[PDB]
Amino acid sequence: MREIVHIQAGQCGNQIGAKFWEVISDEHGIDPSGNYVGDSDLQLERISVYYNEASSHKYVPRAILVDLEPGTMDSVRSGAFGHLFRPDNFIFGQSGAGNNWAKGHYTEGAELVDSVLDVVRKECENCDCLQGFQLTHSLGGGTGSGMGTLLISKVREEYPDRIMNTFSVVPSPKVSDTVVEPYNATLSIHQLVENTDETYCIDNEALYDICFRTLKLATPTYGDLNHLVSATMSGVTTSLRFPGQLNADLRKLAVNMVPFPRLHFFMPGFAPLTARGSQQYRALTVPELTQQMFDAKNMMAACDPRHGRYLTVATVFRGRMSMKEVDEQMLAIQSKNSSYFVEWIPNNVKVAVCDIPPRGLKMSSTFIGNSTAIQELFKRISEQFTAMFRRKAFLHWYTGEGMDEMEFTEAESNMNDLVSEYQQYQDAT
């Protein structure tokens, strides 16, 4: 009931998804072979939302892993946790997009999308009652950004009356992984703003600091970095996967959070984050949980909220608490930190409570804040994209595979408009 479709694009999506389906398997008591070995029947109460029933009590995920370059798939197939996926879903192309938008939207986008859309339709018809779509990708790569935009569009005419959540890894200010980031990002964001519902922007170096500073890890690899982002992603969904005292669903989050069609870029955060050695000297209690969430340091996006104002805020608890303690503390937060909240939405705190605590923790929480601190992220990206484009650098290889200058002019004009409306509403009276 209320089934969810999970789509993966680019190298990041497959690596994040590899850690994702690891978390879900432990949550639902699923052996790597694919057979139920747990005890509680509560996990079976709603198992069809993600997994799928099969013969001999086998379970297969509703995931569609697809990427142009094959190199990622041999890793997921040959590696562990590859005995439970559906071999038909393992879609791959022939050559990677090469960090090019054009090769991800016109050249190799044509033949690959037709194949992947077929598996979506078959998966949708198998579904009993569709709830929405989940897409995990990156805005810096070529295949994940370029094709993911194409897939988001092709899905959109097919299911107009549906919602989707895109958990994108937005590029960093400090360190840039690839040289031509702004060309892929600016083009991708223009299309997403047109035809998407909500978007959870996530940074890398911000999660780098969190792992090194708070968890005190000397060598934070991609294994640990992707592990933390999976827990936030599992926390967002678990409201409808598991019963709770004040339940919420993907539809509830979308409407509570998005006041306007063009302002749907969120910023997540998770708590508690404690080291292995320092967990014994801290009291696991709601006061410190909410305090840990509401500081700039424990935030998974590299934008300090102090330069902006929280437009709307969510908080999806887990474990067992009191609504009194939960909402008494939201009062203490609101009264003390009132200078940082937008004046013209009152009571802008949405709270939901579950009952199943996360593994190895008495209780935890997930904070999703639609803030005005993203305006500094888009301003910087637009600045980087502007200077590079005026001198017409790297342009010969987007023009040489389908596009021309009119796409670049209109994408820049739209992005300037969006940051204009974003600021003009923050400074409204």
Binding site: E69, S75, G98, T178, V179, V180, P182, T219, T221, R391
Partner: protein, 435 residues
């Protein structure tokens, strides 16, 4: 699954290729005879499988003078290469580009093309061409321009990378080097996606100073250049935490259609005795590779400004301190990038530590870095070569050899004006401009 073919031209290409296929075979755990004693595909991209356990490379050795190929035929790697692939002529171009491109070079180009077409149709996921050729040599320069024209005509749009050998400023071996280089650059300027340069003494300075060897035969020089080539391809051959494809190199390094002349660098290059007294940390090999004295082209980067860089770490590498290391490099004073490129770094990581060739001068290392810098310090080297060519041609020296072998002085004029356009574009792009 994704295939790239390698063409070796001239004595330089064959000798480098002997050292290159020395290390690819070692990297994939293949005995010299084709049998065998991460691992399982990987070898499918280079070593085509015969029905038995024998693997044969996708290499096309072509030369006009047969003594070098007769060496590789009779060498230790006799059973590896396909006997049809080794194509020999009868007499070389004798450092005459006119001979190697018009008169004699045209009589064997049909045979090499047929072997290329047969090999390409054998594969299913052809990606691009790797060309190993020199610049001074008559056959190396003469044949490569013919092959680029022929290959580009057959295959419309594919990646075409060349690993050239840039002529030196004081080290000289030929007397017609300014004539061969200028002719080669003009004709292949439009048909090369990305061409790497290497200077012979720059490794000699590196081998003498960094590794402290006083007997650096061409074997030791070939071993160092071979290491750069493999780790560039190693992303295609091996999985990694951040994979980079041949187009990704080509897309991330070429900002303009004409400015596609980067240079290579490798690190760490340290000896066996000094291995014990070093810690081989990620933060310092990033600093060591970027150090101007470690560049493998006889040009100081301090004289110019970088335009784009690409790093490739392999082995036990964490993306965090790699992230930290580039942050300090960017904020450092000596390094200066160009204004229109606020971001100028591409990073690729692989899980396979580099292997060591037995008996090699280098020491075993668990981390390796390869740096491809597209900069403006190369522009000073082009001007110097242009000056040498203009001095010699000023009184029509050696032109009687070239003119008699099917050329005219008009062609020399066009190549001269071509290099002026390339040099004027290179400086005007590198220099800042208002608005």
């Amino acid at each position: 699954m994704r295939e790239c073919i390698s063409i070796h031209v001239g004595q330089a290409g064959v000798q480098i290729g002997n050292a290159c296929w020395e290390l690819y075979c070692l990297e994939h755990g293949i005995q010299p005879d084709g049998q065998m004693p991460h691992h399982h595909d990987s070898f499918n991209t280079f070593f085509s499988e015969t029905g038995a356990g024998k693997h044969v490379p996708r290499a096309v050795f072509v030369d006009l003078e047969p003594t070098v190929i007769d060496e590789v035929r009779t060498g230790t790697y006799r059973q590896l290469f396909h006997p049809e692939q080794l194509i020999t002529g009868k007499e070389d171009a004798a450092n005459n580009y006119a001979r190697g491109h018009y008169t004699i070079g045209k009589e064997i180009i049909d045979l090499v093309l047929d072997r290329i077409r047969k090999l390409a149709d054998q594969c299913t996921g052809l990606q691009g061409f790797l060309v190993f050729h020199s610049f001074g040599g008559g056959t190396g320069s003469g044949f490569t321009s013919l092959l680029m024209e022929r290959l580009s005509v057959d295959y419309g749009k594919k990646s075409k990378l060349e690993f050239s050998i840039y002529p030196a400023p004081q080290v000289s071996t030929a007397v017609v080097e300014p004539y061969n280089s200028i002719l080669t650059t003009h004709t292949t300027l439009e048909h090369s996606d990305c061409a790497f340069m290497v200077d012979n003494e720059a490794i000699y300075d590196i081998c003498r100073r960094n590794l402290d060897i006083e007997r650096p035969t061409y074997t030791n020089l070939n071993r160092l250049i071979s290491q750069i080539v493999s780790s560039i391809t190693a992303s295609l051959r091996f999985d990694g935490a951040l994979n980079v494809d041949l187009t990704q190199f080509q897309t991330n390094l070429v900002p303009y259609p004409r400015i596609h002349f980067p240079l290579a660098t490798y690190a760490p290059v340290i000896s066996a005795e000094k291995a014990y007294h070093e810690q081989l940390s990620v933060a310092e090999i990033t600093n060591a590779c970027f150090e101007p004295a470690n560049q493998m082209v006889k040009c100081d980067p301090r004289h110019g400004k970088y335009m784009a860089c690409c790093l490739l770490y392999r082995g036990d590498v964490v993306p965090k301190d790699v992230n930290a290391a580039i942050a300090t490099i960017k904020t450092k004073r000596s390094i200066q990038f160009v204004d229109w490129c606020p971001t100028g770094f591409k990073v690729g990581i692989n899980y396979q530590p580099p292997t060591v060739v037995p008996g090699g001068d280098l020491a075993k290392v668990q981390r390796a870095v390869c740096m491809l810098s597209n900069t403006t310090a190369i522009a000073e080297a082009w001007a110097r070569l242009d000056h040498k060519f203009d001095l010699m041609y000023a009184k029509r020296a050696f032109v009687h050899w070239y003119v008699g072998e099917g050329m005219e002085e008009g062609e020399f004029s066009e190549a001269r004006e071509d290099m002026a356009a390339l040099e004027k574009d290179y400086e005007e792009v590198g220099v800042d401009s208002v608005e």
